Structures are given as C-alpha cells and as structure tokens.
Write a protein that binds this ligand. Structure first.
Ligand SMILES: CN(C)Cc1nccn1-c1ccc(-c2ccc3c(C(N)=O)nn(-c4ccc5onc(N)c5c4)c3c2F)c(F)c1
Lengths: 51, 234
C-alpha cells in the first residue's frame, strides 16, 4: 500500500501486518486521521520560511 | 553551484556556511537542529579552525540577519579517508543554540527504508551553496540552488574514473552544464516530498565541475542515518 500514493501518508509510510502505518519527522505530530503531519512549531524542519 | 538559480529569500533556510579565519566561506553545511550542523569530513582539515554562519544569502551585504557559531565538538567518521573520500561525513555541535527564523531552519532527517524507497526514487534533488559558478572560477557571493537529477549507480560508477562506494551517489547531468563545485562541499542536498524537504546527501566531490560524462558525487545520507542520531545523542 505504501507503493501507491505513499499509502496516503504525508511523510513516512510503512507496511505493518499487511496494513499501512504513517509516521512523521520530529517537529510534526501524526494527525488524528493517521495520515497527515501537523507542524508543532513555527519553524518546522523541511519547510521554507516565510515572513 | 554551476548553472541553476539564486535561492529566493527563505528557500534554502537550512543552508550553513563554514568560515575560516579569513572570515570567508570554504565549505557548506546543513542545519539539523539548534545544536547540530551536518557537513563533509574532508572540509574539517581544510581550514584548521573555523566557524559556522547561518541565515546568510549575500556575503557582500551585511544584510541584517546572519549569525555566527563556534564548534564545540567535531565528529569525523572513523572510516573516513582522503584517498577515496569514502565516509565523507561529519557532524558539528555548536557552542550556542541556533535560533530559527527567516532563512534559518533545519532540514528534516528521514527514516532509512522510506528514504531509500521514496526519496532516492524521486527524479531529482536540490543542491545549494556559495560555491564556484564555474569549474575554475571564483566563488559566488550569492547563495545558489540547483535541481539535479538522480543518476543510477551503474551509470555513476561507469562515468567515474574513481571508485563509487555504496556510501556515495550520483546526481546531475551528463553533458548539460549544471553541477555543484568547489566551495559547495559539505553543503546540503535535500529532496522534496509533499512540500517538505528531507536531507538526502552531502556535497562530496566530482571530477572537475559539470564536465562531460561526469556527475556530482554525494555522500548517501540514508547510509548514515543511525550514525547521525548517535552523533547527535539519540
Ligand atoms: C585526488 N583525490 C584524492 C582522488 C579521489 N578519490 C576519490 C575521490 N577523489 C576526488 C576526486 C576529485 C576531487 C576534486 C578535484 C577538483 C575539484 C574542483 C575544482 N573546481 O577544481 N571542484 N570540485 C568539486 C567540488 C564539489 C563538487 O560537488 N559536485 C561536484 N561535481 C563537485 C566538484 C573538485 C573535486 F571534487 C576531489 F576532491 C576528490
């Protein structure tokens, strides 16, 4: 499932027990929907900075 | 950086510059956290004692936002060597914490399996730095960034006069004149996925700069992800 649209994960996708499990990088929290990654701070890693 | 374009304000926030006692930049780096900077091992003995500058887009103008930080510890990989440039990776712990803000932010560290299956399979990555704009020219006062395509190891090893270990990888073009150059070394090679950039390589070397039949050689960060976590203390 990770091989199609990244298992619908915003970031890390992993196939556990024949199902998808998403995870996020430090500074992000896995969304309630188990898919999206919500930034926790104003300067989250990987995001170009705006004014 | 040869070719490509100048980085728009805030687009290369994770870019770090290694400065010598001449107060000039010789090698680049990538911000991984407030206390950490990722760079290339071969840069460490290229200025004896140096400092790290962040949030700098223009070395000409004092702009008004840069910052300086001294290295509290130098962590050179044990298997590093000048002959093959293998294990060309090192981490630097600053003495004072980088305060994130405009043009100053860390790139994301990705998980190994995922990065290999999804980031290394993307068509291209982004390289940046204050390096030479030409093979034998001068460095660029302006911070530049270039989109470089991933090249498969076989074509890579073949196009190379030197050995390509599984700790390095190719990126760039065969004849199209765009590439990283002296000065960029140690700098960031990140890959974009769903609007988030992850650290994927470290500018290492190359036979000249943007010549024909040659590509840019980079340290494969996926092969040192555990090493980095160790080096940064978990
Ligand atoms: C002699 N060695 C011990 C043999 C060896 N065994 C394993 C690796 N090497 C090895 C080979 C070549 C270089 C070398 C020499 C010159 C340059 C230059 C210049 N502008 O004159 N610019 N770059 C340069 C920098 C950064 C770059 O990023 N991407 C790029 N194409 C790119 C290009 C250079 C080099 F990388 C090196 F440093 C190490």
């Amino acid at each position: 499932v990770c091989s199609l649209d990244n298992g619908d994960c915003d970031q890390f996708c992993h196939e556990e027990q024949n199902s998808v499990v998403c995870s996020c990088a430090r500074g992000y929290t896995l969304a309630d929907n188990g898919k999206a990654c919500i930034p926790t701070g104003p300067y989250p890693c990987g995001k170009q900075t705006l004014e | 950086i040869v070719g490509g374009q100048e980085c728009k304000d805030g687009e290369c926030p994770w870019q770090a510059l290694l400065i010598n006692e001449e107060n000039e930049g010789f090698c680049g780096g990538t911000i991984l956290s407030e206390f950490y900077i990722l760079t290339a091992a071969h840069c460490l003995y290229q200025a004896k004692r140096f400092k790290v500058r962040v949030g700098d887009r223009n070395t000409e103008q004092e702009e008004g936002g840069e910052a300086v930080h001294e290295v509290e510890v130098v962590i050179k990989h044990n298997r590093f060597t000048k002959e093959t440039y293998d294990f060309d990776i090192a981490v630097l712990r600053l003495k004072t914490p980088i305060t994130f803000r405009m043009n100053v932010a860390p790139a994301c560290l990705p998980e190994r399996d995922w990065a290999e299956s999804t980031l290394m399979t993307q068509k291209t990555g982004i390289v940046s730095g204050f390096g030479r704009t030409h093979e034998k020219g001068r460095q660029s006062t302006r911070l530049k960034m270039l989109e470089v395509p991933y090249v498969d190891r076989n074509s890579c090893k073949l196009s190379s006069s030197f050995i390509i270990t599984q700790n390095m990888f190719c990126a760039g073009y065969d004849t199209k004149q765009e590439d990283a150059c002296q000065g960029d070394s140690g700098g960031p090679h990140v890959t974009r996925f769903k609007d988030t950039y992850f650290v994927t390589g470290i500018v290492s070397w190359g036979e000249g700069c943007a010549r024909k039949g040659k590509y840019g050689i980079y340290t494969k960060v996926t092969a040192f992800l555990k090493w980095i976590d160790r080096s940064m203390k978990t």
